[PDB]
């Protein structure tokens, strides 16, 4: 009978969601003028990797970015001058994530080892060394992010989000309320709470302090491949395996408006907002990226310079550049 | 016009270019294999003849070839999300047990293994990477209902699942009590390298 009770609760929650859907973000912003066609050029290309790259993350200074390849390497690129600060060799090549700590001292990576190796970049010995190896997952580790210099958050193929603790190496909390897999997560500018993706076409709003999902968003269709909050942490744009970027709301608890184009039928693998939030750059399974106006739902300049699937991208903290990394082993800085 | 410090920084960045290039060069001579199959359908015994909680990278050598055999059995997640991770693999060693039609594990193990082989062989990533079928565990195996004819029919049923002219499935039959499973893989890998070099020449 509990299944029927759950169905009734779902019906009442969706009725409540519909009761607060007077506007669709397209009836509004008509008076707002459209953004001019954004022309973006490859300012710098980072041709150092040798195989597919599955993640990149910008430092707080917006000058250093760490990328993970299948060569078995993390590389800490100097974005402004295309220099390799650190070439971290991994124990196991199959890595599918990165995380540059808010302090430039710590980095993380691990995708199929079930473990997010945490590397220390500021050591008296002068070489990057594995500061920790967190082993508590039973599936591929899709994404990991840093809250502080310690106390990271990871999501793995075993349908769990961790919230590790670097000093002790143990599960500080655990986020097990997820029916399907998880592929990517995004943490708020204030790290009190974050969200995680899925493979059951949903996104969950996890609270870091007390482990639970405060809100769930199942309006999407096929899969989730990337998440990123709106700056100020109120609306996370979601990835898609059906070429449909969407941004939900933490307060309205519902989807605002879907971003789709019948021209392209592919799967997003990475989404990141702009600094102000007008742009919603998404790297598609279409050998390129795209720029979406976050308020008019329209399209903008297409950023096509890649040879394979665009696997990662991130707008800098100061919002100056947007580097994208694809399976062609080339990180391209776009400004 | 770079400063004294930034010239040294560029020297370091160029000196770890050489190390990375050498690491990539030394990691391309070896050949990577992806080991797949049904649930414990002769995987463990074959892996034993060749030589956490996720991949198991067996790392062996034979006749100057360096085989890196990645076994993925600890992954309880969907194969779709991490299957493209092995796109640049030389061959996929598909282990299947002949004593599988008797068991049921609704659908018998033969039907499940055959459907899974079809799904793997028709993945868009593995449209050019060849399959090495190991028809292992043939001792318990036993138109005509004799051992050889039924075994040949099973081989044909497995081999019929490809639909590309540039993809070749290599089959072999073992009693799981022999040392030939490295030689068979070596011969198949030599054939795969020969075919890859032929298609690189432009003549198919």
């Amino acid at each position, epitope marked *: 009978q509990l299944r029927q009770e759950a169905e009734q609760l779902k019906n009442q929650i969706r009725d409540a969601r519909k009761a607060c859907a007077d506007a669709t973000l397209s009836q509004i912003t008509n008076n707002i003028d459209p953004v001019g066609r954004i022309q973006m050029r490859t300012r710098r290309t980072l041709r150092g990797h040798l195989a597919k790259i599955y993640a990149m993350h910008w430092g707080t200074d917006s000058r250093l970015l760490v990328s993970a390849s299948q060569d078995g390497k993390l590389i800490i690129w100097d974005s402004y001058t295309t220099n390799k600060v650190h070439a971290i060799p991994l124990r196991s090549s199959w890595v599918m994530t990165c995380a540059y700590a808010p302090s430039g001292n710590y980095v993380a990576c691990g995708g199929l080892d079930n473990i997010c190796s945490i590397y220390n970049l500021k050591t008296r010995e002068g070489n990057v060394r594995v500061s920790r190896e967190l082993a508590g997952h039973t599936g591929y580790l899709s994404c990991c992010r840093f809250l502080d210099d310690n106390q990271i958050v990871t999501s793995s193929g075993d349908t769990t989000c961790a919230l590790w603790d670097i000093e002790t190496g143990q599960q500080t909390t655990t986020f097990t309320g997820h029916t399907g897999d998880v592929m990517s997560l995004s943490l708020a500018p204030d790290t009190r709470l974050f969200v995680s993706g899925a493979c059951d076409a949903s996104a969950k709003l996890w609270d870091v302090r007390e482990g639970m999902c405060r809100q769930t968003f199942t309006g999407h269709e096929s899969d989730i491949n990337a998440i990123c909050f709106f700056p100020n942490g109120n609306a996370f744009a979601t990835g898609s395996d059906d070429a449909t970027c969407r941004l939900f709301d933490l307060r309205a608890d519902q989807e605002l408006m879907t971003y789709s184009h019948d021209n392209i039928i592919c799967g997003i693998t990475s989404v990141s907002f702009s600094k102000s939030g007008r742009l919603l750059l998404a790297g598609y399974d279409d050998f390129n990226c795209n720029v979406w106006d976050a308020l008019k739902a329209d399209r903008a300049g297409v950023l096509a310079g890649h040879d394979n699937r665009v696997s990662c991208l991130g707008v800098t903290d100061d919002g100056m550049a947007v580097a994208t990394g694809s399976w062609d082993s080339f990180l391209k800085i776009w400004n | 016009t770079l*400063s004294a*410090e930034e010239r040294a920084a560029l020297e370091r*960045s160029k000196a770890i270019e050489k190390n990375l290039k050498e690491d990539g060069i030394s990691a391309a001579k070896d050949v990577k294999l992806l080991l797949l199959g049904a649930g414990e359908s002769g995987k463990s015994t074959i892996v034993k003849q060749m030589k956490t909680t996720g991949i198991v990278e067996t790392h062996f050598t034979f006749k100057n070839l360096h085989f890196r055999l990645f076994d993925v059995g600890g992954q309880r997640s969907e194969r779709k999300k991490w299957i493209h991770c092995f796109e640049d693999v030389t061959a996929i060693i598909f282990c299947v047990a002949l004593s599988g039609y008797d068991q049921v594990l609704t659908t018998n193990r033969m039907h499940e293994s055959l459907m899974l082989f079809d799904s793997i062989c028709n993945n868009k990533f593995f449209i050019d990477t060849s399959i090495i079928l190991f028809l292992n565990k043939k001792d318990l195996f036993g138109g005509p209902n004799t051992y050889e004819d039924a075994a040949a029919y099973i081989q044909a049923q497995f081999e019929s699942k490809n639909r590309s002219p540039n993809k070749e499935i290599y089959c072999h039959m073992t009693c799981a009590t022999d040392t030939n499973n490295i030689q068979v893989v070596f011969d198949a890998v030599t054939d795969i390298i020969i075919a890859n070099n032929l298609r690189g020449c432009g003549l198919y």
Partner: single-chain antibody
Amino acid sequence: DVQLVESGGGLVQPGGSRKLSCSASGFAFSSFGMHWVRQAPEKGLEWVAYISSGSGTIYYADTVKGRFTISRDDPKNTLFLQMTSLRSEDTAMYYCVRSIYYYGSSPFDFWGQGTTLTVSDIVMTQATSSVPVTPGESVSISCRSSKSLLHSNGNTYLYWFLQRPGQSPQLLIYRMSNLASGVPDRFSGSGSGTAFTLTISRLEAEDVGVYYCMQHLEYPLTFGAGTKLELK
């Protein structure tokens, strides 16, 4: 532990030769650039030589180029300075210095001990050679550069070093905006592209050693005269 120890602590006849070997164990020697820094019976501090991470980038002080030859080996983690044609002015106690050059790195982190020996170019000045100050009071040390030391890249390659009395100096501030590892927060430096000033709030009895200033725009590196702090 991390340390660099020296070997050749012996008297040398004038017009001779010697070999100084220093061994380091704590860090990854092959990934560090290495320097050499001289001294004298006087408080003078002067640059000697340099070798890069890959041993492919060698520089020298223009006052002695062609007399000292520098080298190093990674298998034994040992850095060598072969001294040829020693004069009377070569007397010093040679410090070995590690320095790794990448964005955000701090060159000149660790200075090992040294063997005492007995027998254009940017110029920096520090007029306040003696600052008698009691503990607990803020202290200001000024260093002046002859060339605009603010490069076009936004960095200012200035280094401030402290030396405890009778100890190897430790780097205090690099680029007059960042503090070295382990340096107390009370230290603080700043300045324009020509003048540089420290603000040592809450001076203690440990912060008494002599201070040196260094420019780093060009490898013809020049140290500044020391500003000894006393208890008068």
